[PDB]
Structures are given as structure tokens and as C-alpha cells.
Symmetry: C3
Subunit: 682 residues, 3 copies
């Protein structure tokens, strides 16, 4: 029979692949009768057989009489000849064995097992009928990975290299129980750390985008070689990439390795990105390169989610984000990275004012021995947070300049250069700085925001530093002293440690002696021992060239009668006060010029004792003096008990000495007297 003796639209319905794709027992043992019949009826029935043509590899096109006898001999011959059965794709098919038992009876193959070794063979194996089930042993020949059950179809579907495998006028659909349990194995990846799994990653991403499946790129456990993947230009909504989903906090079960040729292993443009449970070994220690893990190119708002990420020997920028709206990177470790680790920039697009990054939360991270680039390349990060982070033996902790950062429990240890935080609005607790490490929060370089927005607050166990305003309801003391007794009592206030020669302390004993009514019953005549409401004592202490010395003043109804001091060392000064009788509550409030713990390690201390203690023999009386002036004239008092006065001394020659010009009412001691003054000669 000839070439154009074949009906229009007739196709090969059975090939050697159909012999291979049925169990060995069937090939070798089966003997029976095959009927290719008219569609919509039993093919064994009379006048139902449609034309069938045997075609050799040579190009033979002989018509074959039905039923077609099947047996090992005819199978062997069909395979050897690389032959094919051509007939109507719309056909009935019926097979019975040597006896008469119907194996199958399909009236229309277009309308509703055996094993296949590879995808290569699957794409060349036509289904027997619409719904025909097959088992794929493995994606690649004899790797025992990326296999599963497959349902055959004649309907047109494009090969996606994972779920749909298409041949000439047919395809096989992977039977997927849970779509969220597919991996790169299903898309033809191999965990040998050599075979490029980039085609599998590109195939699985395109599949997820088209079929709208959120799992996206899913790595199974093991090591994967990946060449640069550019999904670039086109803005997508989602790019998710996750390693083996197991609860391993430290070491993910998936590792990525590359050739260091692309600037990033993954080049994406997506509004929402999620990357987790991955180790990236950049191999920059042995084959130096500039290859990072992921860059997001999408302008006008990015959302990022990182979790359980290890960057080992990365020469490039590990993560590069753009126009960040919300970035959460938790449980990430960087070891011996020579490039930037966490980098975020802005498009500069005037609209939405994309001239900064927003809501960066970095938590539970450890950067070790990172030399060359910046661990944090995060300038202009507003409404951002750092929680429980360690950066050790890293040259450049990096840049958080012009930012707004809550920083809880950040540790810098043995870092060559400081964390750059120029014009950065920091709000910190428990910053741990060892081995010469520090944070540079100075006003160097360019300020992004107005001068009015500048300042940072540091809240430490050892004190508070506010580069800004303070306001409170009231100022109290940690130490309230009480003398509910008519007799005075000697207390030891504290031992003052003065780290530097010339350091000055002022102890304000705020509060008065007496709490009895009738202070407005009589006018005050005795300014010292009178009946006035209000009072304080002001003790001055300064570390001198050798040891220290003291001097004290008071106001109103003084809470202190006397103060003595003991200068045991050059740095140490014990301060005692004779707490006046009937002193109900006296608050201890201190001013100091001494360096605090923020400045030096061997810093200023107030070793508070606040205990009843008589000053020992060899204690020195702090002289009772005050001195209020303008550097020319003023008023004071001395320890002898004389009022001190200072003013321009006068020549008697310029004074009308004849008699006082006038008088003014002054209450000298207890008595209202008349203070005289003389006229000044013109």
C-alpha cells in the first residue's frame, strides 16, 4: 500500500515505546488478538475494524488484516524493525488473550499500567487511551528520584518539565496529591552538587507562576549546583525559594553552590519575596568571585522575608534589596564573607518618595570573620529594629547612617572598624562592645533628614545617655534619709570614686528639718534658725592633686548641721553628714563632672552606704561656706561665721563723710535695725 493511500489525519497510535512501557511478563508470555476499531462501538464487532497500517523504519506502509496477533515473536519483530501502527487517533481498541478473555474493551480511546524508566522515554510513549496510568521510575535514567504516577491524555498541554510531559499529540500529567510537596527533583534537579539545577529551578518557577501555585521554587534536602538564574525585567507578585522544610534552627538540610560567574545566583523582580532554609557556599576562599545569593530589582515597594540562612565564603553581596517596605531576616549566620551580607538601597523615584528603606527587622544573627565588605549595608533605614545580634572578628560591621533603629542586645567583638551610624536615630539597650569595637553615631558625612530630627538615646544598666530633651513630673532620690528624733544623727552618705584628678561632685541633700505648722504665723527674722518652709544642704567635693577636699552650704531650714569627709585614696572619698533633728525626709541628688561608664571602664561611682555611722578620728571637717557672685562683686559666708561681702572699694576723698545720707530697714541677726549709707561726692 502507498503513501497517499492513508486517510487524512491518521497518526502513529502504537510504537516500540508501547512494547517497552508494559511489564516484562506481558511482552514475553502474552498471546492474544488486538482490534483497532471505529470510535463509539466495540472494535471486535462486525464492520467496526478501521484501516491499520504497519510502517517499518525504512518507510514500508503495508495495510495489516485484523485481528492483529500479539506474541513475543511479533513484539520482538515490531521493536527490531522500529515499526509503528498508523490509524485514526479517534478509534476504539479491544484486546483479548489466546483463550477469548477480554483484557480491555475501549469504544473510544479519546474519552474515559506498566513502568517507564525516564522523562526522555515518557515524552516518546503515546498513551493507549485517555486516562491510561503509567509509573515513571525516575526523572533521569535510573536515579530513583523525581518519579511518580502519571495519567495519559490526547488533549493539547505544553511540557513544563515537571507536572506536564508532552510528546507528538499527547502528554502525561503527574498525579499530585499535595501540590505543596513537589520539589526540584520533579523538575529534573539532582542532589549531586555538580549537575546544573538552574533549568529545573527556572522550570519550577514558570510552572508556579502559570498555575498560580504559591510553593514556587522548593529544594529537597542535599547539595545543589546552580548557575546564575535571571527571571529579570518582568515584575511578578511572588518569588518564594525554600530549602528542606525541617525545624533546623542552626544548619539547613539544603546547600547551594555555584561557579561565581553571575553577580547573583537569583536575579528576581517581585513585590513579595520569601527565602528560607538555605546554606549558600560562595567558595570565594578557594575560587574568589563577586557572586551573591539573591538580588530583588522590583522598584516602588518590596516586602522581604528571610529565615534560617547561612552565608559561607560569599564574595558578592549575599542579599541586595530595593525600595524595602517591610524586611524581616531572622536566624541568619555569615562566615568568612568578603562582600556585603545584608544590603538594601532605593530607586530614588520621586513618587512614593522612594529615597530610603522602611521596616528592616534583623534578629538572632551571627556574623563571623567577614573581611572586605559590610555585614550591614543599610543606610536610610527608617522604623527599623535589631534584636540579639553578634558581629565578631568582622572588619566592617557596616553602615546604618541616617536610619531610625531600635537596637536591643547588639554585640560587636574584635571588629577592626566601627559600625557607621552617622546621623542615625538610635534607641538602644544592652549594647555589648569588646576588643576595641564601637558604634560611630557622630555627625560626619551627609544628613538625609532635618537637624530637628537628629539625636539618639542609649539605655544601659550602668546609666542613660539622651542626645535630646528630658522632662519628668518630679525628680526624687533612690536614697531618702529620716531623723524622727530631736537629736542629730551621723550618716555615711557614700564613697565617691573620682577617676581623674580635679573631678567635682555636688551632693544636694534636698528637704528641710522641722515639719511643725505655723511657718506663716510669724514673719521670718532669723533666716538660719527661723520658721521657714523649704530647705536644702549643698556638699561640694573635688579630687585635688593628692586625695580630695570638701565644702558645704545650705538654704532655709537646713537638713544638715555638719559634714565630715575621709579621703582614704587619691580616687576614693567617704562623705558623712550630721543629719539635723526632726528631718522627716531628705533626698540625696548628685551632680558630677567625672567620666561615666559610656566614656571609660574605670569610671565614676557613688558607692551608696546611707547607713548610721559616726565619722572616725582623722576625718576632716568640711568647712561651712557659700559664695554667690558675678566674678566682680557678690555675697558669701565663712566657717568662722562671718558674712563675706565683695564690691568696688571706695576712696574716702569721693565720700561726703559728714553724716549718713539715708537708711534702709535690715533685720541683722534677730533685730530690725537701720543700715546706714553715705553720699558719693560728684
Amino acid at each position: 500500500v502507498d503513501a497517499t493511500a492513508i486517510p487524512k489525519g491518521d497518526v502513529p497510535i502504537l510504537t516500540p515505546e508501547n512494547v517497552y512501557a508494559m511489564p516484562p511478563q506481558f511482552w514475553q508470555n502474552f498471546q492474544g488478538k488486538l482490534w483497532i476499531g471505529r470510535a463509539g462501538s466495540d472494535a471486535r464487532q462486525p464492520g467496526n475494524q478501521i484501516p491499520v497500517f504497519l510502517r517499518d523504519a525504512n518507510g514500508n506502509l503495508a495495510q495489516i488484516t485484523q485481528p492483529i496477533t500479539l506474541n513475543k515473536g511479533n513484539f520482538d519483530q515490531f521493536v527490531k524493525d522500529n515499526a509503528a501502527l498508523i490509524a485514526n487517533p479517534s478509534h476504539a481498541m479491544a484486546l483479548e488473550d489466546s483463550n477469548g478473555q477480554t483484557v480491555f474493551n475501549i469504544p473510544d480511546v479519546s474519552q474515559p499500567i506498566g513502568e517507564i524508566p525516564s522523562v526522555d522515554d515518557l515524552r516518546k510513549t503515546r498513551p493507549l487511551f485517555e486516562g491510561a496510568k503509567i509509573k515513571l521510575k525516575s526523572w533521569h535514567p535510573g536515579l530513583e528520584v523525581g518519579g511518580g504516577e502519571f495519567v495519559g491524555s490526547f488533549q493539547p498541554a505544553q511540557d513544563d518539565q515537571g507536572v506536564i510531559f508532552s510528546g507528538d499529540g499527547f502528554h502525561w500529567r503527574r498525579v499530585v496529591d499535595d501540590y505543596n510537596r513537589l520539589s526540584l527533583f520533579d523538575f529534573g534537579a539532582i542532589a549531586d552538587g555538580k549537575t546544573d539545577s538552574a533549568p529545573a529551578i527556572k522550570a519550577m518557577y514558570q510552572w508556579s507562576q502559570q498555575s498560580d501555585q504559591p510553593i514556587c521554587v522548593q529544594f529537597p534536602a542535599g547539595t545543589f549546583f546552580v548557575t546564575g538564574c535571571d527571571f529579570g525585567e518582568e515584575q511578578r507578585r511572588f518569588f518564594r525559594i525554600s530549602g528542606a522544610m525541617v525545624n533546623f534552627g542552626y544548619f539547613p538540610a539544603t546547600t547551594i553552590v555555584s561557579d561565581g560567574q553571575s553577580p547573583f545566583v537569583f536575579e528576581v523582580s517581585a513585590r513579595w519575596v520569601e527565602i528560607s532554609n538555605l546554606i549558600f557556599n560562595g567558595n570565594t576562599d578557594t575560587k574568589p568571585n563577586r557572586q551573591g545569593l539573591l538580588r530583588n530589582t522590583c522598584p516602588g515597594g518590596q516586602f522581604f522575608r528571610g529565615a534560617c540562612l547561612r552565608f559561607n565564603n560569599v564574595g558578592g553581596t549575599a542579599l541586595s534589596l530595593l525600595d524595602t517596605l517591610d524586611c524581616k531576616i531572622d536566624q541568619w549566620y555569615a562566615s568568612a564573607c568578603t562582600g556585603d551580607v545584608i544590603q538594601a538601597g532605593w530607586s530614588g523615584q520621586k513618587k512614593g518618595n522612594w529615597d530610603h528603606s522602611t521596616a528592616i527587622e534583623l534578629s538572632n544573627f551571627n556574623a563571623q570573620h567577614c573581611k572586605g565588605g559590610k555585614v550591614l549595608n543599610l543606610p536610610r533605614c527608617s522604623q527599623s529594629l535589631i534584636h540579639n545580634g553578634w558581629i565578631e572578628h568582622c572588619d566592617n560591621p557596616g553602615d546604618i547612617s541616617n536610619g531610625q533603629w531600635i537596637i536591643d542586645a547588639l554585640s560587636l567583638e574584635d571588629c577592626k572598624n566601627p559600625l557607621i551610624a552617622w546621623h542615625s536615630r538610635l534607641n538602644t539597650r544592652q549594647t555589648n562592645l569588646q576588643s576595641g569595637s564601637w558604634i560611630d553615631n557622630s555627625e560626619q558625612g551627609d544628613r538625609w533628614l532635618s537637624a530637628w530630627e537628629m539625636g539618639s538615646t542609649r539605655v544601659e544598666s550602668y546609666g542613660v545617655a539622651i542626645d535630646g530633651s528630658l522632662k519628668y513630673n518630679y525628680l526624687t532620690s533612690r536614697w531618702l534619709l529620716e531623723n524622727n528624733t530631736s537629736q542629730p544623727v551621723w550618716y555615711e552618705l557614700a564613697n565617691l570614686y573620682s577617676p581623674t584628678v580635679g573631678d567635682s561632685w555636688e551632693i544636694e541633700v534636698f528637704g528641710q528639718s522641722q515639719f511643725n505648722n505655723g511657718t506663716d504665723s510669724e514673719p521670718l527674722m532669723n533666716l538660719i534658725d527661723g520658721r521657714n518652709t523649704g530647705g536644702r544642704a549643698v556638699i561640694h567635693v573635688q579630687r585635688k592633686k593628692d586625695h580630695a577636699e570638701a565644702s558645704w552650704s545650705a538654704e532655709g531650714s537646713s537638713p544638715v548641721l555638719d559634714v565630715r569627709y575621709v579621703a582614704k585614696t587619691d580616687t576614693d572619698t567617704q562623705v558623712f553628714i550630721r543629719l539635723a533633728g526632726w528631718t522627716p525626709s531628705a533626698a540625696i541628688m548628685i551632680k558630677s563632672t567625672a567620666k561615666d561608664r559610656f566614656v571609660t571602664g574605670r569610671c565614676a561611682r557613688v558607692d551608696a552606704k546611707m547607713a548610721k555611722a559616726t565619722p572616725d578620728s582623722g576625718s576632716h571637717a568640711a568647712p561651712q561656706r557659700f559664695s554667690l557672685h558675678n566674678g566682680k562683686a557678690g555675697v558669701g559666708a565663712n566657717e568662722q561665721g562671718d558674712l563675706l561681702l565683695a564690691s568696688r572699694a571706695l576712696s574716702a576723698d569721693n565720700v561726703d563723710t559728714r553724716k549718713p545720707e539715708g537708711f534702709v530697714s535690715v533685720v541683722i541677726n534677730g533685730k530690725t535695725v537701720a543700715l546706714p549709707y553715705f553720699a558719693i561726692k560728684a
Copy 2:
């Protein structure tokens, strides 16, 4: 008590190979016996459609012709349910030989057909293709039983005198598919949810209710009012955090999609789309009304177009809601109330922790309806373009990194004990922490503390070991040095600054080796300079005083702007450490954006010619009498003027020992008559 033992559904169950080909012999004998045997055969009756009971001589011949006819007449074989049964195949082989079908392949398309198929024997296995016909979902392997078990619509499917139990390798891999839910976002999956809940309660399995990935239409599920221990509801368990792989839609008719009453509640990995934007309604997601303590756990939740209260909680002992998003919700989002109609016992909520959330374009309702929340926390939250950020009044809140942008009305925080850091207020948004409305606790509990980068505001007490300065100036030379302290920005006319230069000049011993005679230049311990700066109608003017051994000899100022004033000090020789401590009446960053600044220079710099000298003055009085000094170098005195008439003028009454300038001297006073 004979029953139908075989039906048309039994012919359907077995492989199609069997129907078409199988020739054989079927025996039904008495139990505890091989039925293929003389004297073992019990009577078997053939029921037909509109047909008599009749009887059939065993063995029962099986072939295509018989099966076709048997199915045709909707026929059945009637016998004693407790029977022996054996099957041969013309050849005389054994397919199965069962002495008793009472105690120890096939595919079935639907649960409808499964509930109609009687098992051949106890432990007979079949495949369920799908829960619903031709839907490829909710299927599995089932082991048949004659024992009486009730249909639970998921694991056990019951007929008349039989049931089918699902083989479950892991109970935590069951979904609503297995209980007959359809992920088409139209067919009501409420029967499946109710069925899976009832199952999990009775079987005491903790997974409770578990959605697969996809969209599900759910009519209101009211889980009675009786108090349960647990209610867990979860969408597709895949690590996302942004968009859960499970969406819920509804008809908006119930007040909540889930009416629960449990001590411990878990919602996670769900999007609820309320559809108020198109079909206005008042349907929330979940309300828990279990009294006497509640525990809540929310994670990865999206609320889109919710008209009702998204979450309603009662008598909360502990509530954690992390990674939750609300867009275009017209009702309340996070709502928590209490049972106690009077104070004492159940009159508040405890341990509310909201973290990593974003409420956007929520108009009408309160995003946070959380009054009287004690020991509570907010961490990294954003409320943008919302009418009512909500109510946290009479609360106790740690608030880290809360953002309010373009919110019409303030976050109501009346009498609320706030402890805040890095609050971002943009586009006229603010927090009302005032004392309006009812105070829940005592007046002694009130107060908030706001720690910002730009300053600290304490509505309460402060105490510290000692006050130091950010700026310590040193002059370890004999010669005075001109420093520029800072530039002061005074945003309002009249704003007053006072720069206390704490510390003294000189640090040599023997200050208490002689009495103080010269109050200015004497061997003294202690000292300070007090520089006063006020912004006047035009520019600023200054003046300054000192105490003891002054650290400052001179003060000059440069004021070439209404707002700006540079302050310079001539730091005295041998000033080993001088601390700069400032007071100001000027508005800080909490009040205004164009706020007060101290631009610290603290650098050696001579005043630039045009600088004006700050007069050396002090003034201590009561408003009637006092003492002072002026720049000329004169002591000032103020007191009541006396008439010479009222004074005994001829002789001084007495004297007092006064040290004038350097010398001890007698100060006179005349008597008044």
C-alpha cells in the same frame, strides 16, 4: 433475621476485569464452615425489582450474562448476615474461602456509593476514588466492618448493618477534603468543618479542623455554647507569612463564621474575605465566648473586606497575634472584652501581645478594640489610612515601633500605662494618652514613659545615682581659653535657656587649711557658672553669674538670627573638668517638628569681633528685698527705705563682724525709734 448480603454496588466495587471475564461458582454456607462442602450450604433468596423472594440452587453460577441481568433488575441476594462464603472460577481454583465473614481488590467512585456497598467480609479492602463523584479529592483506602459504628462523615461511613473505616497512617494529615469539602469557593464546606470538629472532639485528636489549600465557602458554624477544652482551626500548613494558601468566603448572614467556646483557641494560615465592599454585612471570622479565662494564638492571618468584628475574645488570660493583616475592614479587627459586670474578678484582659501586623484602609470600626489590657505588648505594627486605630484605654502596654500614618482620629489611650519606643506619627496621626472618661485603676497607677531617639518624656518620677554631662571641657594650662559651647535654636520669641557650667577652676590642696576671706578668688572647693540666654523680640540677649571658684571668666554671644544664638565661654586657667548641663523653656520634638536644638560645638574658638559681651550679673530676691551684682562690679541691695526722722541718727546702736573684700571689718547699724 435475614438481610441483603449482595447488591448491584457489589458488582460495581470489584475490578472491571471481573465483570467482563470471570466465570465461577459462588457458595453461601453456615458460619464456622467451608461453604464449598456437602451439608454446609444455607438457603439463598434472589430479590428482583418488583420481584418475589424465590430461591437459587447453589453453587450460584457467575458470568457476564448473570452480572448484567443482576444489575439490570436492581436485584439482591438475601441470606443470614453471619454466613460462610467461598468463590471458585470454573477451573475449580479458590479466589476466597471464608469460614465466617464476621471476623478476619475494588475501587468505588463516591461516599454515596460507599454507604450503599455492603462489604463481602469483615476486613474487606476498597479504594475510595474521591469523597464526591469525579473530583479526584477526599479519597483513600477503606477496611469494611459489620460491627455497629456511627457515620462521622470523614473516617467512618455507615450503611444498614455495615460501615467503612478509613485507613489513616497519620491523623495530622487529615483535611476537610476527607470530610467532604470542595475547594471551589461556592459549595458550603460548613457540614465538613462541623463533621471534622465533632470527630476531633470525640476521638480526642488535637489537629481539630484543618483546611487544605484553596478557597472555601463557609456558612456560619455555631459550635454550641457548651465549654470545650480546645478549638484549633488552620489553613494549608506551608511557611508563607504573607499570603496563606487557604481563603474563606461566606454569605455574611451569621455574626461570625466560627462561634466557639473553648479555653485554648488557635487560628493560623487563613485569609477571610468578608465581601462588605460589594455585599455590605456584619460577619466576623471567629468569636470565643468561653467564660472564666481564654487563651488565643493567631499567626499568618489576612482580613479583607470584613464588616463584622474579625476576632472577638472574652476574659483573655493570654493572647498572641503575630503576622496579621487587615485591608478595607469596616468593622472592629482585634476586639477583647470581659464578663465581670462589676470590678474585682473578670473586669479586664491580660497578656495581649500583637506583633508584625499591618491594618490598611479600615473605616468605621476600631482596628484595636482592647480596653483594660494589662501586662500587654505591641511590637513592629503599622496602622495606615484607618479612621480609628482604636481603644487601648486603661491598659498597660510596652509599645515598640508602632506606626500611625494618615489616621483620621487618634489611638484612644485614656488612663493607659504606656512604655513606648520609636513611635512613628505621620500625616496628622497621634496617640491620645489624656485623662478623659472613666479611670479603671487608682490615680497612683497612672503615668506613661516615652523613650524616643530625640528625647525621653516621663509622666512620673525620675531618680539617678548622679547627673553628669555629654560635654566635659578641660583647661590644663595657666592661660584662659575661648571655647564655643553650642548654637541654641529658639523656635518661639521669649524662649529662655540656662547653661550651667558645673565644675570649678583650681584643683590644688589646702582649700580647708585657711578660712575663706575672698568669696570670689579664695581657696574654695565647689563652683559653677550660670549663663542665661533668652530670645527677645529681635535676636537674643544674655547675662551670667558664678559660684565659688568659677570655671568661667567671661561670656560673649553671637545672635545674627531671630532663632540662632552661638554662646562662647572664656574657660578659666586650671579648670580640670567642666560639665555642661542645660535647662530650656523651648518646645522639644514631642511638641513640634521645628523644635529647640543644642548644636554642640565644644571647640576652641575666639568670639568673632561682632560677638556681644554677656553682662556679669546675679539677682537673688523674694520680689520685695534681695541681693545681687552688676557688670560694673557693685553689690546690689534691695530693702524697705527708711526716713531719717524714724532713726536715732547721732550714734550707731551696734556692729557685726563682716569680711568686706578681703579684710574682717565692723558693719554698723543705727537704731529705729
Copy 3:
């Protein structure tokens, strides 16, 4: 068929190649129905062909051997006799094997069973006794233990040597079966022979799965399925390893894990590990100390030179021993953990180094989202010398000893101690705290008792509360301002009510500083100051003193420079409460209210000091008490002041006329008295 052969006459290296287990291992349909012929031939040949058959010996019940004639006839009768006689076919383990049915159709044709249908086996006991038919032969294990249908799966046979690991490899005499594992992360202790009955000791399974994961370098380590498991003390001690992971059923249950461990109390810890990295998650441990008292904890890690620890979703019920014991911790995260009625320590961490260097502390301890209830006899937290450490949102209620965090460095947010018998011991501990909730006499002892680990210079705590701030250390700021700035852009003085002062104790002193001045007109540097009160001056303030007396309070106020205040009145109508009014001067553009107090704050007492700020325009009631205008600057002997009558007060040593030269004033000094520059006279003192 019947050729009697001696055991000593059987070729060296010949073994039982087929046993009754091989008949039981076939599908039941095969046993009953199959009829055919079996060939055992030389390795590398078709065993059916002439001159390829090797000698096969049938062993009988009594142990006798006869060489059988091939082909070997297979049928139910022969299968029954073979099993009934507990018979075996002995031949060369290296052999070809061929099976035909009675028709002559080949089932197998294997030229060498050592080079690469499917039966079922009830238990591993039976699996270890079943020799594979050939290399790569597939079998289906129903379950690990007979009739439990857990720990079953698909197995592929081999004659290659492999040691039994009791989970993945099950070996017999010259063969083994390897489990088909698609995902090694889906294996559980069921696969290693554990039973979820809470009675049968699953220690062997835990030890087996552990040693497998170590030898195989699989990070999953020990994975429990859901249920209650009985575990005797497991010792993985002495040998220093990298990893120890142990986890219960991995399903997101927030509150109650689906896996419970229960033990006998005989070991000090259920798990004795020595690893650098440790992960415990999703486990309830019921110590049963309430009914059978003991000192058994859950886990101790003894690995020296740095330990990492991650804990999540852990419940400790009735634990008699130390629940968790860590050594030389470098990083410890314990999130979502609960302790109920435990009599021992719960979270314990110590160090190895005796001397004050190297390993003498713990580092980066982060305890979060925890709740300890009714724990009595031990420390909930036994964590001395914990540096760079954090507590976030934790409750300790009705526990005798909240524990020891002394000599530490802690951020503590939202810690609640309620009805705790003893304080949390935090001696010399560097605390940085917010929203600490202490109820029913619970407290934190942050005193300086016992040995201080670090230097005196490192000491101090900061407590930031809603009601106030307490700094045991330095404070510095750019400038002090006020919550309250009062304005009077008006030539007339205006009355304001500042606040109601609540003084909880008799003798409590308040000082209200009204910082700022009256006037803001230029030319204060034009004239020399002559009138110290009303003169053109820059700077100023009013200082208001208020003290609670035996009954009510009384006041008194002084001023500086250009005073912002003209008058002060007050209302003391109770012992505790004092309203303060100020007559704010004309043209005072901004006055900041700043306060000092001796009164006890909220840190000290519940009924604490208050400033009930009003800061509003209000004229004081005619019955209000006027505050006397006074100041008083002295040294206790001499000084200066002013009284409300408007007289300057001076104090100094009195002089007798006899020691004064009354003749002439010795000299004069220039003094500006009431604006006018005059000469203040002075007399000389006789020697």
C-alpha cells in the same frame, strides 16, 4: 529425589538459599494456586538449559540431607510439606535461578541472584529470617512489631554485607533488607521499633535512631511520632559530638505538644548528651514526682568548650530533677516553655572553669513566652553569671523560688512574678527592665549580697516603668525641659492652678521651680543693672517650697532675675492634698514647671506621691492661703535672706562696741541700694 547425603559431604560455602519464610513471604494467592518448576543453576547461565543445573540438597525436619532432582516441582502440596517439615533447600549462594509455571511460561530467568512477585512480611523478626530470592528483590513489611501496623514499609533485599541498625537495615545470616526512604526527614522512632503505648521502653529505638543518624550524618537525629512514650535513661555521654536533635510530632500545636515522654525516675536525666549544638522541641515530659518522687530531669548536656541550645514548645509536668542542665553556654534560646508543679530546678546553666577566666559564665540566654506554675523546692531559673541575656513576656506564679540570675546582664520585658514565696535573686545583676509586674508580695532582690563576679565599675541596673524611671548609674541629656510650658502674652498678670500635690507622708517636701522670666523686650545689655528685682535683666525663675506639716501643708517662695511669678497662694484642705496657684507675671512668654520631691514614688509604695497637673487659668478661692515671699542663703552660722514684710535679712557674728573704733568709719565700698549708687560705711576692729 531420594539421595541421602551427609552434612560433611555438602560443598563448602553452600547455605540455605530458600526456607519456609520464603513460602510465607510469597503472596497467599501464589501459595494456594501456583503450579510450575524451579531451577537452581550455575551463576552466569540460564538454569533451565542442559548442563547448567548445580546440586541442590533438601534438608528435612530431623535435619537429614538428600540431593533432589531438578527441575523442582512447586505446588500447594509441596509448599505445605516444605513448611510442615521446617525444610530448607541448601545450594551455592552464588547461583542462577529460573521459575516456569506448569504451562512453560517463565516467571523469572535470573542468571545471577547476586546481580541486579512482591510478598508481605508481618514483623522484622520474620524479615531477619527471610532470605531474599535475589539481589534487589522487593518485600512489604506490614509493621515493625507483629500486629501493630506502625514502622512498616517497602524493603529491597541484598546479599552484600550491612550491619543491622534496627530501623533502615534489618540483616540475617548472609543477607539484609534496606528500607526504601524517599525523605529521611519523614522517618520516626516507629521505624526503629518504638511503641506509642506509654509502657514499652522505647530507649532501644531512641539509641538505634540516634546511632543511625550519627553514622549516616542525617540531621533529623531522634524524631518521635505523636503519642505517649516510656523512655529509660539514655546515655550518649563522654564522646563529644557536633549535633543532638530530639523533637516530638512536628505539627503546629501552640499550647500542648502531641508527644509525651514518661520514665521510671531511676536516671538523673532521661537524656545524657554531649554535643556542641542541641535542639529540643514539641515534647511534654511528665516526671511523675507527685506520685513516685525522684530527681530525673529531661536532658543534661555535658559537652565542654561551648554549648549552643534551642528549645521550643516544651512542657515540664511534675519534674523531680533538673528539667534542663546546660554547661559553658555560648547561645541558649528557650521559647514557649511551661513548667507545672516541678520540685527541682527547671532552666539550669553552669560553667566548667574554676578560675576567673575562659569558661566562668553563660552567654546569650534568651528565655521568651514562658509560664511557671506551683513549682516548689527548686529554682525555676538557675542561671547565675548570664551575660548578653534577655527575658521577654514570662510569668512565674505560686513558685517558691523564681530562682537565681545574680552577677548577670539581662534585658527583662514583661516579666510577671505573682504570689512567689521568695524573691528572684539578682545580686550584682546588671538589669535593663520594662513593665515588671510584681503581685502578692513577689519581688526581685537586685541588692549587693554575696560574691560580685565582675568589677564595681560594671555594676548598676536601669528600670524603665510607665509610672517612673530608676537609674542605678549615670544620667546625661542635651537639656532639661517641662511637660508643662505656661504662656502669658498679656501686660496683665494671670492666675494659674499648677497642680494638686499628693504627699503620702508627714514632712514630705516639694520644690516647684518656675523656670523662665517676665518681659522679652531688647536692651537688657544697654543699661548696667541697678534695680536687682524690676531692672532690665536676662534669665530668672520663681522657686516655690511646699512641705506637708503635722496637719495640712504650708508654702513659701523665692525668685531670681526677672521673676515669672508675682504672687503664690495654696489650698491645703486635707492632710495629703495641696493645690498650688501662681499669679503668672505680665509678658512672661514661656515658663517651664520643674519639680523636686522627698515623697515616696510608685517604686517604693502603692499609695505614692502624685502631681495632679491642672496647669489651667484659675483664680484661687478668697479663702486660699497666701505663700510668704522669703529666701535664705546661709552656711548655718552666717548668710543673707528676705522676709514677706520686704526687709533684707543678714546674719553674722555680733560685735561688742568696746572692740570697735567708733570714732570714724575706716573706709567705704560702692553699693547700689534701691537703685541709687551710695557708699556703705565700715569701722575698724581694735587689735
